[PDB]
Structure formats: structure tokens, C-alpha cells
Amino acid sequence: AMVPNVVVTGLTLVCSSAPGPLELDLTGDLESFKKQSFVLKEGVEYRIKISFRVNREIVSGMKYIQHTYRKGVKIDKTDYMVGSYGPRAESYSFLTPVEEAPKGMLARGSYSIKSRFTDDDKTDHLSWEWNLTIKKDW
Numbered sequence: 187a188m189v190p191n192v193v194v195t196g197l198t199l200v201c202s203s204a205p206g207p208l209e210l211d212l213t214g215d216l217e218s219f220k221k222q223s224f225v226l227k228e229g230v231e232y233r234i235k236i237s238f239r240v241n242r243e244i245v246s247g248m249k250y251i252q253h254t255y256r257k258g259v260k261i262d263k264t265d266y267m268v269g270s271y272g273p274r275a276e277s278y279s280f281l282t283p284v285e286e287a288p289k290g291m292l293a294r295g296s297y298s299i300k301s302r303f304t305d306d307d308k309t310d311h312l313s314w315e316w317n318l319t320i321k322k323d324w
Contacts (some may be wrong), residue, residue, distance in 0.1 A: 187242055187265035194303045195277060196237035203230050205324050210235075216314045223317035227324050229289035234282040236268070236303065238311070245252065246270045247306030250280060257299045268303075287320050294320045 208224045221271035226232065237249055248268035254261050268280045288294070297318045303311040 191240065191242050191246055191273075192303075192305075192309070192311045193239040193241070194236065195239060196201075196235075197225070197233050197314075197316065198235040198237070198300065199224055199227065200235050200281065201230055203227065203324075204232075209315070210316055212312060212314060214313075216240040219314065219316040220298075223319045225319045225324065226287040226322050228287055228294060228322060229279055230283050230287045232287065233284055235313050236280040237277050238280070238303065239277050240271045240273045242273050244270065245305050245309075247309075248280075249304045249306075250282070251302045251304065253300040255300070256295070258298070261297075287318075291322075295320065 187199050187275050196212050199212040204226070208220060234252070238248075248271060250268055251263070252265040252266075265287060266280070266282055271278060297320070298315060299318065300313075301316050304311045305311065
């Protein structure tokens with residue numbers, strides 16, 4: 187502090203067919219997201235974008251982890267290797283591969299995501315929880 191070396195600042199669902207913005211400001215109140223949700227139309231393509239800042243020194247083996255739950259039941263875990271980053275003025279962005287929202291009536295509904303940004307020292311750069319609601323339409 188009071189400027190940390192690593193600051194995780196945002197999550198964006200990058201989705202060209204979405205009618206509005208799908209952004210979590212991660213510098214604010216993280217708890218607020220648990221009673222909120224991003225709506226995605228079933229079957230649409232999107233990426234998850236993590237925005238973060240490195241301010242003073244090199245960090246190795248940065249890693250993004252998402253655990254997906256449905257009705258409080260864990261259904262999946264995915265780990266994404268972000269890499270080694272040096273300090274820079276401009277924020278960095280990490281994009282996951284393109285994936286598709288679930289599709290079909292049985293796969294619709296609400297999902298919760300537990301996200302974590304870490305490194306090879308297992309530093310908790312940020313941990314947060316957010317929701318996805320899969321719908322027939324926007």
C-alpha cells in the first residue's frame with residue numbers, strides 16, 4: 187500500500203451481442219456483486235477480461251481461477267495462466283478463451299462464480315464472487 191504492487195481493478199464480460207455493459211469495478215465494494223447478476227442470452231459467445239495493474243516490481247506466474255457453482259453446488263473449476271508481468275503505467279488485460287453461455291432450457295438459470303487472482307507466491311491479489319443469469323433472451 188497505500189499503492190500496492192498489484193491492483194486488480196476490473197472484470198468485463200466481452201460479449202459483442204450484449205445490449206449493455208457487463209463490468210465489475212473491482213476497486214469498490216466486492217460484497218455488492220453477490221445480490222447482482224450479469225444476464226447472458228443462452229448460447230452467446232463471450233470472453234472474461236481481467237484488468238490489473240503492476241506498479242513497482244516484477245510478479246511471476248500470475249494466475250486467474252474461476253470456480254462455478256449452481257445453487258451453491260460446485261460444478262466446475264478452471265485455471266488460467268496469466269504470466270509474468272513487470273510494472274507499467276498502463277493497466278494490463280487478460281482475456282480468457284472465447285466460450286459459449288450454456289444453452290437449452292435445462293441449462294438456463296443462475297450460476298455463481300468465485301474468482302481469484304494469484305501468483306506463484308500464492309498471494310491473494312483479489313478474491314471476489316459474482317453471478318451469471320442465463321436466459322432465453324436479453
